[PDB]
Amino acid sequence: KKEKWGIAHIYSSFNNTIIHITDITGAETISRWSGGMVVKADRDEPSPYAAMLAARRAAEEALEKGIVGVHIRVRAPGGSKSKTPGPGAQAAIRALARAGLKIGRVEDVTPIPHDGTRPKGGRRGRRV
RNA sequence: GCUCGCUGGGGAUACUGCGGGCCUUGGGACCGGGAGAGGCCGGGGGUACCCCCGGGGUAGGGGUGAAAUCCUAUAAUCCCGGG
Numbered sequence: 001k002k003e004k005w006g007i008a009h010i011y012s013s014f015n016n017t018i019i020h021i022t023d024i025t026g027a028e029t030i031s032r033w034s035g036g037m038v039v040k041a042d043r044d045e046p047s048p049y050a051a052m053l054a055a056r057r058a059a060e061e062a063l064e065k066g067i068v069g070v071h072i073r074v075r076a077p078g079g080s081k082s083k084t085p086g087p088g089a090q091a092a093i094r095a096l097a098r099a100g101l102k103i104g105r106v107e108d109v110t111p112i113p114h115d116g117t118r119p120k121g122g123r124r125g126r127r128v
Numbered sequence: 129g130c131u132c133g134c135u136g137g138g139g140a141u142a143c144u145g146c147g148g149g150c151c152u153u154g155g156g157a158c159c160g161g162g163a164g165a166g167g168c169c170g171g172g173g174g175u176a177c178c179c180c181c182g183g184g185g186u187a188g189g190g191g192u193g194a195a196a197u198c199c200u201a202u203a204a205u206c207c208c209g210g211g
Contacts, residue, residue: 022184032205036187037188
């Protein structure tokens with residue numbers, strides 16, 4: 001068939017967003033970009049704007065490297081942490097769409113525990 | 129009348145006590161088909177989390193209302209193959 005398809009792993013949280021493009025197997029990295037080096041203040045890294053910028057940069061790198069199609073994999077921290085993706089997940093996906101990348105299957109691979117470890121914060125939780 | 133009562137006799141047998149007899153309603157015993165995170169012992173699993181090694185890859189990661197401490201160039205966050 002001769003089409004180079006990859007996988008875009010999106011790590012979305014309430015503090016930062018990471019976009020990482022890799023080959024079909026996932027063992028070879030193509031482009032890794034996040035909001036930390038795109039924005040300046042720590043409060044704007046998880047912003048959808050920073051998500052769009054980082055996803056766009058990763059898309060340009062992948063296109064120059066010779067990637068046309070990609071399968072999305074959204075991921076929240078999961079485990080004992082939050083189970084909900086951050087604001088910069090759909091923004092990153094649509095930025096990848098805008099940059100000129102074909103999008104195949106879209107899935108959430110957040111690690112869900114089957115009554116695993118104890119979450120942080122104590123029994124009373126955070127009281128701010 | 130009071131000394132809250134004691135004592136010698138006679139009568140009663142509904143009730144209570146005592147002795148005997150006859151029952152099953154309360155409660156126990158037993159059989160039948162089922163229900164349940166009731167308890168103990170043994171054997172096989174679920175992802176998740178943490179660590180270690182081998183590859184990919186650069187400069188960030190984390191965290192907050194905002195920051196900082198902290199981890200990171202001895203190759204971090206993140207992805208993959210394994211223990």
